[PDB]
């Protein structure tokens, strides 16, 4: 069973840092294995069409 994605920590458009987290989070549904959303608002979800390609985000420490 493949592990869920990780939402890396980021800073939002209001300048606030959000810590990263492994998907699904403890009180997420078990199918919420994808880091979804936008670079400024990342969250675990189950829908491939909502996946965030985090490698392209600029507002995190990642390559």
Curated annotation (Swiss-Prot):
Plays an essential role in the maturation of presomitic mesoderm cells by individual attenuation of both FGF and WNT signaling. The gene is Shisa3. Belongs to the shisa family. Disruption phenotype: Mutants exhibited no phenotype in either head development or somitogenesis. This is Protein shisa-3 homolog. Disulfide bonds: none annotated. It is found in: Endoplasmic reticulum membrane. It comes from the Eukaryota. Residues 1-63 are lumenal.
């Amino acid at each position: 069973q493949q592990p869920g994605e990780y939402c890396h920590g980021w800073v939002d458009a209001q300048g606030n840092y959000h810590e990263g987290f492994q998907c699904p989070e403890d009180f997420d549904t078990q199918d919420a294995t994808i880091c979804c959303g936008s670079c400024a608002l990342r969250y675990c979800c189950a829908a491939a069409d909502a996946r965030l390609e985090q490698g392209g985000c600029t507002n995190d420490r990642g390559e």
